Amino acid sequence: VRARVISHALKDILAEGDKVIIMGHKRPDLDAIGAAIGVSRFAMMNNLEAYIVLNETDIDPTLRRVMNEIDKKPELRERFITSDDAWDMMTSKTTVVIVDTHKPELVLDENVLNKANRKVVIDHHRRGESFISNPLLIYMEPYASSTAELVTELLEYQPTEQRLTRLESTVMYAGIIVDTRNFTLRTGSRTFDAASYLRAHGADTILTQHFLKDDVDTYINRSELIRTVKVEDNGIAIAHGSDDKIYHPVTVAQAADELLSLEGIEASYVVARREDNLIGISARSLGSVNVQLTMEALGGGGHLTNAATQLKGVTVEEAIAQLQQAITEQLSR
Amino acid sequence: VRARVISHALKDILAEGDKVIIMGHKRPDLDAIGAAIGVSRFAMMNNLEAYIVLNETDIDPTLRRVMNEIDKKPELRERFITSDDAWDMMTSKTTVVIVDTHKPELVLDENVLNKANRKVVIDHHRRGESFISNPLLIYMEPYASSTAELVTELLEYQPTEQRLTRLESTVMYAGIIVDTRNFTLRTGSRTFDAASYLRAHGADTILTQHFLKDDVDTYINRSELIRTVKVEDNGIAIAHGSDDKIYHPVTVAQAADELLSLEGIEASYVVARREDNLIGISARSLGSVNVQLTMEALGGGGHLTNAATQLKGVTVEEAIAQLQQAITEQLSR
Ligand SMILES: [Mn+2]
Ligand SMILES: [Mn+2]
Ligand SMILES: [Mn+2]
Ligand SMILES: [Mn+2]
């Protein structure tokens, strides 16, 4: 019933101003874009005027794959405008809806935020210190999977002559996929209700997969690391890169994450050269083995299930030796 | 709609007999076991007495992880009985419910089936030549994801005091996950509606992950195949094992599955030696390339997205050339 009330109050706020400007966070991912797209359908269902703020430099390679689809459909492509155009078209009666963030310094264009007199915030994160000043409406649900999930709930209570389209529901659906790691994290019954709504409007599994495809080369580098793993009887897994090959930190972190998906692994440590004189270790855990303590013992840190260190002046071999020492230490307490 | 009527018609049939015996197919997977668990909760929501037929020899390694969790953490185990105990227990007033199959010779214990005078069939496969004899109720829905999805909908209409437990809903949920490959196949809005109901009752997505983890050797063998892939500009990918290394057929199929998650791959063909005189090829596609036609051209077959063949007396290099001949013949324009 609470989404129903938010939904009708947002419709009133939007109808009230002269148009709607929608913005997510700097370097938008598919949830910020999908949420923004959902709010522009919200406005349209009510024959209101709405735009989504996006600059060419905001479009990372995952987003470019979405934009290539959006370009095939002008009703949808025409809603996207630059920061400059957004600035130029705003009056004191324009409503800016901020999606998928709540912190002024994270918003995609802070200057557009500063220009605005009427603000709405829809977000699924834990509110901290800074916060959008004087919103007319706040829809925050730190338990929700994603802003797409939140906006999908608002859509249900709005007129249906101008329905969510197939492409639009696919982008929203992909945002939920990215934020939940395919219904693996932060996923509640309401996440599945949002998926059902999106799916009933044609959200396309295959196109979503197309957006999220992995590169062949990075799959092959990640698996070079993994193919070396050795797993001890207590579930401790160690994998490494060879001493004269430098690995991208992103690949090392992924390999560490990927080891946890395999049977029998309680915690993973992946040791790979980072530079000419620098060895990285990425550490992950299911949650029983504390990889933070072992990385701290080696001059790094992070969290209980996710930590790392960088070791100056050692080979990969020596790094592996110092890690085994730290692990033994910790295990004998 | 059909769901509401079937749910009340099922409750009448089950309460009219003296008890309920539930069976899936031989070598049961998680959808068979979760659907059976769901049916037995359907019985208990109505204070009927219900059991599921399972013998020790029916328990594969995946099912064994489920049964270990069931022994350690609930009392679900008492509702599982051997073929013999089921036999000893049935009368002409016992209702046998068949889940997730409809062919007599695939039923877990065909003698239990033949003793039943009262039968019910719930299945999501396409009806075929043989079929259960003279059932009191047939619920066949070929477009549903899974029998777990079908049974979940029936539970929604039943009294709610004796609620589905957390672990019961997890196993039901795991059978959806397996049958849909994590919501990428045969997944409609009703599939998500069933996932919502299960998650609301505590279905644990992390425990589900634990049940399904692949082992390290399989990852490694599989990535040995994936690393050879060559992707053509038309989306056609071929990978292969060397001519002197035998691969497990499961690993070949999984390698072909996994190539479809990579950028630029519309159809994958994985060529690898199966015996000293036999080459296997597994083929998968995202729906634009008909790998059924390709494998039919090489003396095999299967479906539009999933096909295979086996080639006698050739090297993998010979098998590859025959495959490329068939490919360019199939897609020449
Ligand atoms: Mn985001
Ligand atoms: Mn988000
Ligand atoms: Mn099955
Ligand atoms: Mn099934």
Contact (CB, 8 A) for B198 and B172: yes
Three-state secondary structure call for residue A128:
coil
B62 CA: distance to closest CA in chain A (Å):
11
Q: Which of A312, A313, A263, A254 is nearest to A282 (CA)?
A: A254
* Block residue for tokens 């051209």: B297
Three-state secondary structure call for residue A115:
helix
Q: Does one domain contain both B3 and B122?
A: yes
Q: Does one domain contain both A220 and A207?
A: no
H or E stretch including A333?
none
Q: Does one domain contain both A36 and A47?
A: yes
Give the C-alpha separation, B260 to B254, whole Å.
Answer: 10
Sign of CA dihedral A302, A260, A229, A274: negative
- Under an 8 A CB cutoff, do B226 and A219 touch? yes
Question: CB contact, 8 Å: A68 with chain B?
Answer: no
| C-alpha gyration radius of chain A | 23
Three-state secondary structure call for residue A306:
strand
A199 CA: distance to closest CA in chain B (Å):
5
The tokens of B125 are what? 């496969």
Chain A CB contacts of B190 under 8 Å are 196
Q: At what angle do helices B166-180 and B147-155 cross, to 10 degrees?
A: 140
Resolution of the solved structure (Å)? 2.2
Q: Which of B134, B153, B106 is nearest to B6 (CA)?
A: B153
Give the C-alpha separation, A257 to A252, whole Å.
Answer: 9
Q: How far apart are the CA of B189 and the centre of ligand 4, in A? A: 17
- Under an 8 A CB cutoff, do B182 and A182 touch? yes
Last residue of a domain, one of A188, A213, A238: A213
Nearest to A262 among B184, B200, B216 (CB): B216
Chain B CB contacts of A263 under 8 Å are 213-216
Q: Does one domain contain both A113 and A7?
A: yes
Q: Does one domain contain both B231 and B170?
A: no
Residue list, annotated binding site of A for 3',3'-c-di-AMP: 254, 282, 284, 310
DSSP per-residue letters across A2-33: HHHHHHHHHHHHHHHSS-EEEE-BSS--HHHH
Tell me the residue type at B115: K
Contact (CB, 8 A) for A308 and A281: yes
Q: Does one domain contain both A12 and A156?
A: yes
Long-range contacts of A231-237 (CB under 8 A, 24+ apart): A231/A264, A231/A265, A231/B216, A234/A266, A234/A331, A235/A264, A235/A265, A235/A266, A235/A267, A235/A289, A236/A266, A236/A267, A236/A269, A236/A289, A236/A327, A237/A262, A237/A265, A237/A266, A237/A267, A237/A268, A237/A269
Chain A CB contacts of B191 under 8 Å are 199
Q: Does one domain contain both A208 and A235?
A: no
Contact (CB, 8 A) for A175 and A146: yes
What is the tally of structural domains in chain A? Answer: 2
Sign of CA dihedral B161, A191, B76, B25: positive
Per the structure, the complete domain to which residue A234 belongs is given by 214-333
Question: CB contact, 8 Å: B304 with chain A?
Answer: no
Give the C-alpha separation, A227 to B305, whole Å.
Answer: 29
Q: Does one domain contain both A241 and A330?
A: yes
* Block residue for tokens 């007396």: B313
Q: Does one domain contain both B162 and B17?
A: yes
CA distances from B33 to A140, A305, B26, B58, B285 (A): 39, 33, 11, 11, 29
Distance of CA B153 to the CA centre of its chain: 19
Give the C-alpha separation, A146 to A187, whole Å.
Answer: 9
Query: What secondary structure letter does DSSP report for B247?
Result: -
Question: CB contact, 8 Å: A213 with chain B?
Answer: yes
Last residue of a domain, one of B185, B213, B241: B213
Nearest to A209 among B184, B188, B192 (CB): B184
Q: Does one domain contain both A163 and A235?
A: no
Is B288 labeled as ligand-binding? Answer: no
- Under an 8 A CB cutoff, do B216 and A184 touch? no
Question: CB contact, 8 Å: B68 with chain A?
Answer: no
Q: Does one domain contain both A226 and A298?
A: yes
Residues with CB under 5 A from ligand 4 (ion): B 31, 100, 146-147, 179
The approach used to solve this structure was: X-ray
Last residue of a domain, one of B175, B198, B213: B213
DSSP per-residue letters across B76-129: GGGGEE-HHHHHHH--TTEEEEEES---GGGBS-HHHHHH-SEEEEEE-SPP-S
Q: Does one domain contain both B94 and B223?
A: no
Residues with CB under 5 A from ligand 3 (ion): B 29, 31-32, 100
Give the C-alpha separation, A78 to A57, whole Å.
Answer: 18
Give the C-alpha separation, A278 to A311, whole Å.
Answer: 6
Chain A CB contacts of B152 under 8 Å are none
Cβ neighbours of residue A141 under 8 Å, at least 6 residues apart?
A: A124, A150
Q: How far apart are the CA of B174 and the centre of ligand 4, in A? A: 11
Question: CB contact, 8 Å: A233 with chain B?
Answer: no
Q: In the Cβ-directed half-sphere of A232, how many Cα atoms lie within 13 Å?
A: 12
